[PDB]
Amino acid sequence: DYSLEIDAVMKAAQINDTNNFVQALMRWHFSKETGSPFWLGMREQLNFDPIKDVKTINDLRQFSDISHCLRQEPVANLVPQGLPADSHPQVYESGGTTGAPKYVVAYDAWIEALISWRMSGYQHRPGRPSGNTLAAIPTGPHIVGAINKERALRLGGMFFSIDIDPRWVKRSLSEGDTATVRKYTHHLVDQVQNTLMNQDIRFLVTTPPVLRELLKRPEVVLQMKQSLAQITLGGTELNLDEIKFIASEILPDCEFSASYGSTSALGVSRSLLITSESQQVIYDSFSPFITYDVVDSITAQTVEYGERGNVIVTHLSPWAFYPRVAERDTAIRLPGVSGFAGDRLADIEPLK
């Protein structure tokens, strides 16, 4: 048993101090008894002592991104030896859309915690809406699946999804294939159309192209006017005006937000409500578990508030440690309202 060690971390985690939390988990991960086999096996390859010289969140700047590894590393070793017997491990992959695919492990406690964080703020808000959720997103080996199912149960209906293979979509628009992308996009909208038109759907998770498509279908729009309380847009292909126009002129009773995948850190980040009065899309991460740095593409250097840079993300929780993953997007750096740790993002945009 180590569950009272573990509480201490989750405790430190919100009495807002980076510091103590970082050290506590640096200990969790590298100390002999409790650590991952993987990190324990990695300690001797580091040129610094993860205990002695490593105090601030920022102080993790000294690990490099170990994703190369996770393609080969047999998943059983990723699992912190000090988690309970019934922790309930699970493998998720990170888009083997070419350069193919990186293995990771997550846990129910973890996803539960992610979600309570996303949803605080409206979980308990009087007259908050209720109903099923249609999530038009990957499930299968993709950890968004499992994160979305979890939200859907807390909103009082059932979680519904579609058949979607993002890996073929990709390997085909990259592969240059025009007709396919249209035909498969079709088949996606058709699936979403059916469920919206045959079960009462209160909550839709989808993406601008797909929404954009549904809005072009007279019967569906009408139906959306009747039943959607809130839509989440995922991707980075987001045009703020378009959304303002939808929100005010078409689905005026439906709120909007955006979601940002950071598969690398075993989670997703959430936007504020995007309204007509909104002037950028703004994101927060589940800090300190997940934290963003935003850095210059030339000099690896955290850039100033207000400027564009490259998203660097870091997961540090009792379940998993992933320092300092370069994500493949740029964002405006903004002071992160609480702590105490990690940055806000605004207006995420793709790379080169």
Place this chain on the structure above:
Amino acid sequence: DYSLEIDAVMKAAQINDTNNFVQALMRWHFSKETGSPFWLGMREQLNFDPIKDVKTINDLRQFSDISHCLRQEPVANLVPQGLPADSHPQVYESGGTTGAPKYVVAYDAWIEALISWRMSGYQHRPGRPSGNTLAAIPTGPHIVGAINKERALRLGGMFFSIDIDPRWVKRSLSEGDTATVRKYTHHLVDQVQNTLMNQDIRFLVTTPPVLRELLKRPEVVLQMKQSLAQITLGGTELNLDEIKFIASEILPDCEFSASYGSTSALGVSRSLLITSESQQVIYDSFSPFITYDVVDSITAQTVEYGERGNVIVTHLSPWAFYPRVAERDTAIRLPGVSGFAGDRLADIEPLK
């Protein structure tokens, strides 16, 4: 709370008192405080009284298939109120066949009972192999996914899958889009490869066409001789010598079995291990919960043992009640293990 009603139904199953079990569930499903809104309402369209006029399994012949009907029915109404608060309804579909589809509801406790029935005989027996599962099958809204996930957690390793979008294969297939069925399969095969190579998996779930393009790869085949222990093949494209050959010749000691989805009975029947003895693939179902009848296409009369007929599957449990689904496959009918209600099936093929 109704733990004692469920207990009785379970216990009448576990000692095969088929009439008790059926009579109990008619009460359970048809009565104002325990049953699903759907059945309660559906009663006013029947012309017999489930509670009084139904005494044995055959007696359900009085019911008609109520499937084409679960496209628009509200999912929440499928849920028997007699189930507990905590029972975790989750929503699954089938019949993305042409474009439909039919929503149903499943529960952890059912999924669990099912798997337990699938897995006795081996679960415990000495020396039973054990490790990771790779399941080349759909997740998303396909109960099949959920099913295997369960199984994999009981074989001491984790659950790997792949993106795979069976409606696409299907539509394409029956478009004549012959071009990209073959492209797509390559994609599935590739994704399988990867995991086969990068994580050691003990058990694979797939299908004859894919395993076919798969054994065209010499180094996957070496990995396979090395790591696989058990292979479950589903779909109904089962070619028998083709397997017996594969198992005898190509990879000579992985064991091989078949699996058959009756998705609108919320479950999968299992075959007897295909030995090199095997003269027909034979499936057991999870009786009395799931029971099969095999019926002549003109008279709906139950065929003699050994004639091939059109298959009818029925699901009756404390979780759901789907009487008499016209599935879309023929089989040779066999005696089921006497004591148990329902036929054994052999050498299933599809319709025309």
